[PDB]
Design a binder for this molecule. Sequence first.
Ligand code: ZN
Ligand code: ZN
Length: 413
Amino acid sequence: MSKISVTVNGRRYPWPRVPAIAVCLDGCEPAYLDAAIDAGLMPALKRIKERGAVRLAHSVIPSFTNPNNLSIATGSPPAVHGICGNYLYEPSTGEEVMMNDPKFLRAPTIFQAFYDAGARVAVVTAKDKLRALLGKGLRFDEGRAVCFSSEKSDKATRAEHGIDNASAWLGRPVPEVYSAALSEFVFAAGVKLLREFRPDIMYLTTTDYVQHKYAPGVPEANSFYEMFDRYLAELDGLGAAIVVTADHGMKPKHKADGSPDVIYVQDLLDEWLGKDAARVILPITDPYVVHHGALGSFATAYLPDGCDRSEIMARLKAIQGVDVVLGREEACRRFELPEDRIGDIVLVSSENKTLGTSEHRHDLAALDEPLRSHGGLTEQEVPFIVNRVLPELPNAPRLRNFDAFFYAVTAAA
Ligand SMILES: [Zn+2]
Ligand SMILES: [Zn+2]
């Protein structure tokens, strides 16, 4: 007898005999888990690690939320699926266009591929914009798909989400967006779906709210992972094959005085090339944001026609804190990104620095706690833990976070 599989984006996924789940712990620097385990707060994960398979994996660069979530969802890097940031810039028109709409997704998800093959599929996110992206191609007329967010859980309908009012269904209120509870709702929904819906494939993804605010091992960080462990215990006890990974890590990005350590790339380019001759893009978040949330460790820039790219790169790279500067072609080859959605140059900053645009007009400092962020090579390493015995499982750099479903279904088969 032939084995049953589904082929998606050139990869062969064995049919899972038991439910296959991937959990994306947003911004989960490996140190978060080590600290919570050491504090005695994660007895389930501690045992799961001992008896299963423990690895580190590499995220996509940029180590941003949407590109990595969509990589996990498709089993492919952004060169394939097309989502490499929250927005890009079009030199013609001079318009900044969002890339968090499903029309911009260029490859099928693992979710759609399994759904089309007759599987039961569940996707739960914390944020609703991601929900629409991740849910592309799912259908809700056969009772075989559920896709909703914690954020908009009370708005879910049978026809568009596979469930009527997920808040009422779960019996929990819609959480505050800026909270740990937004993520707890996802885990709780995941458990109830595993019990009652019985998916073949399920994705649970959270937000990095706690992680931007709190360093590994502090009470508020520990409490978050202590909470997660309870849901992990339940999912594991219900018999699912589970991969726990992350979209990216998290590092401090502040000076000794606690203030943001920022390299203002637009100011530099305005000086060398003329004001607004070049355009610096900060794709870690939406383009309208000017409140420290727009500070990450990866940026891209569009340069004036005919200018000496090589010279500009060298000037930028010479700056202490700018670690990597690459042209479009090299950046796309090295980081596996789409050429048509990246600028002329790509910048990656040092471990404890971020990249900004300008000091004139400026970016206001909102929250009080010292800046923590991601986007760079120093937030690429993420946990990758499976609750099954898998001696052949690779390790970083070979193992990627977007191998999560490949190995989850392999374990489940
Ligand atoms: Zn994230
Ligand atoms: Zn973030």
